[PDB]
RNA sequence: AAUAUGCCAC
RNA sequence: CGCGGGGUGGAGCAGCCUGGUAGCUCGUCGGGCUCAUAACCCGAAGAUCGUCGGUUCAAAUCCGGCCCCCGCAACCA
RNA sequence: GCUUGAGUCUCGUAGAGGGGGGUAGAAUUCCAGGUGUAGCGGUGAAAUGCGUAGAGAUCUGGAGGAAUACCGGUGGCGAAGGCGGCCCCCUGGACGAAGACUGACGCUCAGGUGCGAAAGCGUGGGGAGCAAACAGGAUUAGAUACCCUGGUAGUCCACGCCGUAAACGAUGUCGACUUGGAGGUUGUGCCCUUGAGGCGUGGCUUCCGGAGCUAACGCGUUAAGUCGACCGCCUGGGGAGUACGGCCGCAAGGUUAAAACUCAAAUGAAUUGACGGGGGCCCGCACAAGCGGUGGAGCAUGUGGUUUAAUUCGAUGCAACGCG
């Protein structure tokens, strides 16, 4: 209902899933879409195509706010960093800022123990 | 790794420049390094091993420069 | 094989129409090396379908083939625990071979009388997307669409 | 992804 | 001794309380994969229900006893 | 007596050397709230777990603990264990230049004393994250494991105790001598700083290699080369670093340390193969792509087994079974 025009798109692409959220420039979320909600389970949930589909779905879900241009902030190391931004621009939003906001502790806590598969 | 799409900068080249900025910052290397905790003994051992292999490769390189194969 | 095949075997175009596509169709339909029988059956099916429709035999055959031809199939790749049904686009020769093979499988499994009648009916159904052949193509494309996530490879 | 074992002179 | 139960393929359990018919797992047998065995895969058979006698057109089932196996109780002096 | 060993003073130098105190930003977690919807999280797949009581995501503001990304370097310091954000206070060692000073004041070290990672123990705190134990899910024939989701001690601090580690350059400390090369780091001298250059000299440190040594692998001026001083230690394997007894400890246990029996070996380094669920490069109807079969049916034939007086003997993984 509210018109925002200038939005911010947070992509959160981990090794297993990609969450795309469109907010205003205040952090108020306007919509979201996930690779797991776009009909992908397990082996396929974490692929660039899945991230592309999720980004497209989020773009279409946030249509009535009349968003024209987007900042873009990318977080995580997952595959969904690339196809997600491609799908946003293909949807049509004017991508004006692309930022990596991946948390990098300046030490920080102790990571989980290493797997032995 | 913050970029600003400039005037008359198309999307594909903006994304390419963002890619190269992320690699220049090396963020994904640090995240894949921090995904698990590796003991200080493992850190020291693998640092020493990487240095040893680099030295061996360069010595073999500028030694085989003085070698004919065919 | 680990080397590479030479050029494909030369195929003599069939006498009635002079189409190597129809020659391949006859060969695929042939059983126990009875090309005379296969050609007679194919020719009867072609004339029957041409008479029921109105099209020229060759162009009607092309339409029936095109309604069955796939574009992307799925092949198996190994990574671990499970297999990848990777979708790969098909080359045109394999497209035609697969279309012919699916048509012939559907025709053989149909329940009519003479195989010429079966083939004419199956090709007629393919002319409006009804046969087991077009059903198989539907299955192939929807399976490839399901596995589309693996396409990047 | 799972894939344990091998006693009868030589 | 009283009271509550139980007896079902080779073993463990269901079914039975609402009488019209007995299933599950393991095991056994046959084949398969393996150099061979185990695991695994695919098919098959197996008990006529503790026992006697009734009831009923029909009893694993209901009933009465009988046999064996558990559980509670066998007290006050 | 002497000074060249040893030591002191004068000037500077580089450093995660130590102890104490403060603070900084990034991040995870939690708490309060705002937007905001049905998923999240996880895996090889999956499920346990979280979520419509509104999660995840995103934003704001707090709380608290721990560790200090980049610099970062077979770089530095330390006797070793070890020490890495920044700042301040106290403090140890090394090193260089020139001179003066003392004048063998030295080297080693049984017993002794101190320090000594991690785990652990006692008391009082603290507790974000991680995580033995534990519980659930999964895998499997089983899986009291690997994997997943949670999770307590403990990791953190103050003090005390333990006194062990593959505490390892598996190489005791000190001193002298014996071809080199490429670095790294830290001073110092000359000239020309004439372009951060060369030319020397000290200290520490990394790699290659010469003579020599070594069983070989290898070491090689930082020796495992040639010698000297002192100390520690070994005497086949297993039993056994165990038992008993002393000492230490609050306990776990540590330290000192046998024996009976038993075997004729155990062992190190290299060699040739073979093997690998090691790597690289290949090949074959090996797979993949296709066509047609067998396994089901009846029959033929051979085999095993039963049978019989006899069902003659042989072949019986592929490479026996329409085989002699
Ligand atoms: Mg994990
Ligand atoms: Mg001593
Ligand atoms: Mg400790
Ligand atoms: Mg304890
Ligand atoms: Mg404690
Ligand atoms: Mg405590
Ligand atoms: Mg806690
Ligand atoms: Mg468990
Ligand atoms: Mg765990
Ligand atoms: Mg020791
Ligand atoms: Mg050490
Ligand atoms: Mg070491
Ligand atoms: Mg030692
Ligand atoms: Mg000494
Ligand atoms: Mg040093
Ligand atoms: Mg050497
Ligand atoms: Mg020696
Ligand atoms: Mg002892
Ligand atoms: Mg003792
Ligand atoms: Mg094949
Ligand atoms: Mg048979
Ligand atoms: Mg058969
Ligand atoms: Mg015989």
From Swiss-Prot, chain A:
The UniProt record lists the keyword Ribonucleoprotein: yes
GO BP terms, alphabetized: cytoplasmic translation; translation
One GO location term (cellular component): cytosolic small ribosomal subunit
InterPro entries assigned: Ribosomal_uS11, Ribosomal_uS11_bac-type, Ribosomal_uS11_CS, Ribosomal_uS11_sf
Pfam families xref list: Ribosomal_S11
Keyword RNA-binding: yes
Gene3D superfamilies in alphabetical order: Ribosomal protein S11
PROSITE patterns: RIBOSOMAL_S11
Keywords: Methylation, Ribonucleoprotein, Ribosomal protein, RNA-binding, rRNA-binding
MF terms (GO), sorted A to Z: small ribosomal subunit rRNA binding; structural constituent of ribosome
NCBIfam families to which the protein is assigned, alphabetical: PRK05309.1, uS11_bact
Function noted in UniProt: Located on the platform of the 30S subunit, it bridges several disparate RNA helices of the 16S rRNA. Forms part of the Shine-Dalgarno cleft in the 70S ribosome.
Annotated HAMAP family: Ribosomal_uS11
Other noteworthy facts: Has been predicted to contact the N-terminal domain of IF-3 based on footprint studies; exactly how IF-3 interacts with the 30S subunit is controversial.
Known partners and oligomeric status: Part of the 30S ribosomal subunit. Interacts with proteins uS7 and bS18. Cross-links to IF-3. In stalled ribosomes contacts ribosome rescue factor SmrB.
Family: Belongs to the universal ribosomal protein uS11 family.
Name by which UniProt lists this protein: Small ribosomal subunit protein uS11
Curated annotation (Swiss-Prot), chain B:
Pfam family, one: Ribosomal_S21
One biological process term in Gene Ontology: ribosomal small subunit assembly
Family: Belongs to the bacterial ribosomal protein bS21 family.
Quaternary organization: Part of the 30S ribosomal subunit. In stalled ribosomes contacts ribosome rescue factor SmrB.
Name of the gene encoding the protein in the UniProt record: rpsU
Domain of life of the native organism: Bacteria
UniProt GO MF annotations: rRNA binding; structural constituent of ribosome
Keywords: Ribonucleoprotein, Ribosomal protein, RNA-binding, rRNA-binding
GO cellular component: cytoplasm; cytosol; cytosolic small ribosomal subunit
Chain's role: Probbly involved in recognition of ribosome rescue factor SmrB in stalled/collided disomes; fusion of protein fragments to its N-terminus decreases ribosome rescue in the presence of SmrB.
Extent of Basic and acidic residues compositional bias: 59-70
Name of this chain's protein: Small ribosomal subunit protein bS21
Sequence ranges of Basic residues compositional bias: 45-58
Disulfide bonds: none
Region (Disordered): 42-70
């Amino acid at each position: 209902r509210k018109q925002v025009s200038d939005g911010v798109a947070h992509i959160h692409a981990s090794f297993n899933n990609t969450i795309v959220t469109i907010t205003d420039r205040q952090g108020n979320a306007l919509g979201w879409a996930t690779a797991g909600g776009s009909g992908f389970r397990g082996s396929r949930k974490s692929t660039p195509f899945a991230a592309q589909v999720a980004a497209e779905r989020c773009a279409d879900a946030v249509k009535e706010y009349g968003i024209k241009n987007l900042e873009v902030m990318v977080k995580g190391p997952g595959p969904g960093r690339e196809s997600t931004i491609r799908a946003l621009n293909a949807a049509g939003f004017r991508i004006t800022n692309i930022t990596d906001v991946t948390p990098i502790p300046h030490x920080g806590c102790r990571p989980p123990k290493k797997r032995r598969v | 790794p913050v970029i600003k799409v400039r005037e008359n900068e198309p999307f594909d080249v903006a994304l390419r420049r963002f890619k190269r900025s992320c690699e220049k910052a090396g963020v994904l290397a640090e995240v894949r390094r921090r995904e698990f905790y590796e003991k200080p003994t493992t850190e020291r051992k693998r640092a020493k091993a990487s240095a040893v292999k680099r030295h061996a490769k360069k010595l073999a390189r500028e030694n085989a420069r003085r070698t004919r194969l065919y | 094989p680990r080397r590479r095949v030479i050029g494909q075997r030369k195929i003599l175009p069939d006498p009635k129409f002079g189409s190597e596509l129809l020659a391949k169709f006859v060969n695929i339909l042939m059983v126990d090396g009875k090309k005379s029988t296969a050609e007679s059956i194919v020719y009867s099916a072609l004339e029957t379908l041409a008479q029921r429709s109105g099209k020229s035999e060759l162009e009607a055959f092309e339409v029936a083939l095109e309604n069955v031809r796939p574009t992307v199939e799925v092949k198996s790749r190994r990574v671990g625990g499970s297999t990848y049904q990777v979708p790969v686009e098909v080359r045109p020769v394999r497209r035609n071979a697969l279309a012919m093979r699916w048509i012939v499988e559907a025709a053989r499994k149909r329940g009519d009388k003479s195989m010429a009648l079966r083939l004419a009916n199956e090709l007629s159904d393919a002319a409006e997307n009804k046969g087991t052949a077009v059903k198989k193509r539907e299955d192939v494309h929807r399976m490839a669409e399901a596995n589309k996530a693996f396409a990047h490879y």
